[PDB]
Structures are given as C-alpha cells and as structure tokens.
Amino acid sequence: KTLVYCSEGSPEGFNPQLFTSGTTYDASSVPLYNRLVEFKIGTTEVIPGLAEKWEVSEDGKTYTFHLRKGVKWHDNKEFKPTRELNADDVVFSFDRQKNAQNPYHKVSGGSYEYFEGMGLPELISEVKKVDDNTVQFVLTRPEAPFLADLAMDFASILSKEYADAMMKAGTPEKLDLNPIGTGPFQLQQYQKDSRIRYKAFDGYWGTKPQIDTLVFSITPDASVRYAKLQKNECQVMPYPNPADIARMKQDKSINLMEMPGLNVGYLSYNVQKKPLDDVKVRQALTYAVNKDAIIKAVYQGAGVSAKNLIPPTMWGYNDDVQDYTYDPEKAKALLKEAGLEKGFSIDLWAMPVQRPYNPNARRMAEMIQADWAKVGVQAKIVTYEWGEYLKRAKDGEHQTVMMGWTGDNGDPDNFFATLFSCAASEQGSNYSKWCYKPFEDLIQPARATDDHNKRVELYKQAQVVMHDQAPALIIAHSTVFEPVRKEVKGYVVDPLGKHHFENVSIE
C-alpha cells in the first residue's frame, strides 16, 4: 500500500546531524534513522530505541547504553552491510561531531549546528565503547535533559561501516547524501524539489510499517496542498492555510486534527550588527510593531500573541512578564535617545515556506516593514530559498530574520539554551548572535540540577532577562492543525512537530 504526503518544501539533505529544519528531519531522521532512545509518538516520553536499556551513575555523569542485537542496516546500490549494529556505530556517530580529528568531521562542511549549539563538545568528555553492545557517555557534569537530548534527530546513529566504505572509495560525501540507516523506511529515489520515494524496510528491527511505499510530493503552496488533499492526490499535508481551516472542518472527507502547539515565532535582531547592538534600538523596533494587527491578519485565530520564548503549554512559563505594547511614540522617543532621530535602514529576512509557527512570513514582513516605516526605519525585505536562508542566517549575513521553533524534547533547555546561549551564538541556532552573562548565569545552572523546582525558578527569571534585553521580537504561538484524509488510520499529531508514517495504515 502507498501513502503520499504533501511536504511543504525540500529537505536540505539526508544527514540530520548537519541541519535544523523540520522540513529535512521529516524526510531524513524520521523515516530513515534511529536514536539510542526514542519518544513515544505523540508524547515526550522516552522509550528504548537502538538502546535496549541504560543506566545512569549516581553522580549522574555516566550514561551506559546497552545496544540491542539483530539490528539491520539498509542496503544501497553502492553498499551492502556485512555486520549488524554495534558500539562502533554509536561511537562514530558522536565522535564525528565532537572530534575535529575524525576524518568525517569536516565532510559536508562540518556544521554540527545542534551538537555545538547545545554545548555538547564541552559537556561530553568521552564516548567510550565498553564492549560491542555497550556504549558509555562520560559527561563533565550532570545534564538534566541529557537522556531526552539523545532522542533528538541530531543524535541519530549513522553507519561506521558505510562511512569506512565511502572513505576508501574516496567519496565520503555519499554518507551524507545517500543515506543508509536502521529506520523503518529506506530512501529509494529522490528527485530534487519534486518527489521523494521511500520503501518500507523489510529487515527493520521493530514493527514494520503497514505502508509499502511512502512518497513525499513536495508541494510548497498551502492552497495547492489543500487542492491535492481534496482530490486525494495526497492523504496528509502540513501547515494548512488559516483561511482554509473553516472549510476543512466542514469537509467530511477530511479529518482536521488539531492540538495546541509547542512552538514560537519571532524576529531575531542580529545583536552585533549596529545599531541593533543597542537595547534601546531593539526595544524601539519592538514597540513600533503593532503585534495584534499581525496576529489578526496573518494567524487569523490559529495563533495568539506571544510574550515569552516558551509557550504556555511549557512547564516554566513566567506569566508575570508583561509584553511590550504597540507604542509608536515611545519608539520614536527611544530612537531619539539613541541618536537616531533621522532613522536608519535594515534588512528583514522572511522565509518562502510556511512554518508551523508562521503561516505566511512573506505577508508578515510587509506589515512589519510598513510599521517600521512609520518611525523612520526603512526596511528591505529579503528572502532566499528555505535551505540557503538558513545557511546564511547561521553565518550572520542578516540584520533581522524571521525565525521560530518547535520543541524537540519538551524541556525548557531546548528553547532558552539551544536558541539564545553563547555557545549557540557562535556555532548554533542563536541567529540573534546574542550572548549575555546574566542570562547564562540562569540558563546554565538550570541544566545541572535535578531539583525540578530550582529549574522552574531559574527559567522563570530567564524570561524576565530576555524580555528586558529584547534580543528578539517574540511574535506568536500557533495552534497545530494537521489535515488528514479519512482513509488514513492511526495518525498521531506529534507535539514535537514531526510527521510519523510508520504507525499509519491507509486502506
């Protein structure tokens, strides 16, 4: 049986270690790979994955994982596995990222964004191989969300054997381009920006998917995705156009699944691109934006005004924080104080794809542009292809960027740290390039304690600091709506933002 998913864009590549967008994860990590530990679909609960069981030392600095046996790897035209999963794979997967001496470290650019952004190089002291079926992680300090961290997409295990093969053949790039994983599906064919075909893996270690063939029909236009859904040319599609929600509810052939989101949408101010280095300027730009107008026009009831990086559905939300108000006058005032009465110019980057946290960045950009123009700030809206957009944003080419996030492990750390830490400002997703001690002083300790309450107090203070510093213009939290054809049985809306098709069965 064949199932066809209408994806929002093209995957950046096939090695989840190198990327950060969900677009790529849905086509790489999710269908083709596995992690030592995993999340039960639809929840944020860890479940054994490639690791059958594990133990944590009393000091909380040593995680010991027992790999399960009889785990087969996929077969490619250029490669056929001779052995099954072993500790050598796991060690390789992590060493590649941590160790600059590993041959593969610089392959494909060597941009281990998450690993580096999460400060893993300093956290992980060593990745030991106790024996062929037992791996050991020795940390420099205890990391509360570490177990969870390992269930994330970047922590996907790649094949050491296949890696060696391509190494000898003189074409290591193929490891990253022609994926061989242990996952339920296996890449069969990929036509750039058009279609991706996967076949169910027969030798999969777990429950084989009831779908014999999985096809991603890359359809970037939300209206077209809906079109295809109706004509049953697609059974599932993500990020429905807010206007279309109404219809979809009414449509009897469509089962519009809805669930509150674990996401944020915001504009990052590149804090080291003057005049954005001035808090006053950042605050001014924030006050000048009529946020409510945006929520109303763009989200149309599908989302709500946001004031914190963390959504209300997260266990750290500081509701005492009071959002900035739309106050053009105050904006003008601050701009005066900063010595910028005459105004200035900046670019505003907006992505060309729909995102769970931003239904139409394009239109949102125009509104912000217009608002800023009213206080004398001339903005140039700039947009590159989704992939390029992220690449350059990371390199810091922008002055202002539309961005957002969807929790990866249900832990506040994955939000505050991964997105606004100093480690993240250097090689991570902190596109605001903001690094501030007072913040670090809260965020870092909050990662070491097992005392959930101290964590809560810390993350709450963090939201204040962040508010005062205005490193980004927090825009909105969006509600998740996943349109699914009625013929599709067993679909579960993933709070972590993935689109899982193993468990699904169309008939």
- CATH label of the domain that carries residue 250: 3.40.190.10
21 known ligand binder? yes
Structure-token match 């005062």, residue found: 468
Q: Whole-angstrom Cα distance, residue 484 to residue 496?
A: 18
Same-domain status, 402 and 298: yes
Structure-token match 């479940």, residue found: 47
Same-domain status, 174 and 187: no
Per-position b or e across 167-178, b if 16+ CB within 10 A of its CB? eeeeebebbbeb
- CATH label of the domain that carries residue 82: 3.90.76.10
Chain CA centroid to CA 10, Å: 15
Same-domain status, 229 and 297: no
Same-domain status, 434 and 344: yes
Structure token digits, residue 202: 């027969």
Residues 6+ apart with CB under 8 A from 78: 165, 169, 174, 178
Q: Do strands 213-217 and 195-200 pair parallel, antiparallel, or not at all (unpaired)? A: antiparallel
82 known ligand binder? no
Identify the experimental approach: X-ray
Same-domain status, 320 and 220: no
Q: Are 241 and 229 in contact (CB under 8 A)?
A: no
Cα separation values, 493 from 176, 322, 356, Å: 29, 32, 13
Range of the domain at 103: 10-178
Q: Do strands 303-305 and 480-485 pair parallel, antiparallel, or not at all (unpaired)? A: unpaired
Same-domain status, 200 and 131: no
355 known ligand binder? yes
Tally of domains in the chain? 3
Give phi and psi for 475, each to the nearest 5: -95, -65
Three-class SS state of 196:
strand
Same-domain status, 266 and 335: yes
> DSSP per residue over 63-85, as a string?
EEEEEPS--PPP-BTTB--SS--
Q: Do strands 344-349 and 377-382 pair parallel, antiparallel, or not at all (unpaired)? A: parallel
23 known ligand binder? no
Same-domain status, 236 and 305: no
Sign, CA dihedral 45-48-53-56, equals negative
357 known ligand binder? yes
Structure-token match 């809906």, residue found: 226
Structure token digits, residue 246: 């109404």
Q: Which of 178, 205, 229 is the last residue of a domain?
A: 178
Q: Which of 126, 160, 178 is the last residue of a domain?
A: 178
Resolution (A): 3.2
Three-class SS state of 252:
coil
Cα separation values, 17 from 37, 253, 481, 500, Å: 16, 38, 28, 19
Chain CA centroid to CA 205, Å: 26
441 known ligand binder? no
Same-domain status, 245 and 108: no
Sign, CA dihedral 5-9-14-20, equals negative
Same-domain status, 146 and 240: no
Same-domain status, 126 and 184: no
Q: Are 15 and 33 in contact (CB under 8 A)?
A: no
Nearest to 406 by CA among 331, 356, 461, 337: 356
286 known ligand binder? no
408 known ligand binder? yes
- CATH label of the domain that carries residue 467: 3.10.105.10
Q: Which of 159, 178, 197 is the last residue of a domain?
A: 178
**Which amino acid, residue 78?**
E
Same-domain status, 388 and 413: yes
**Which amino acid, residue 404?**
G
Residue 296 CB neighbours (<10 A): 12
407 known ligand binder? yes
- Sheet of 62-67, strands arranged across: 51-56, 62-67, 134-139, 124-131
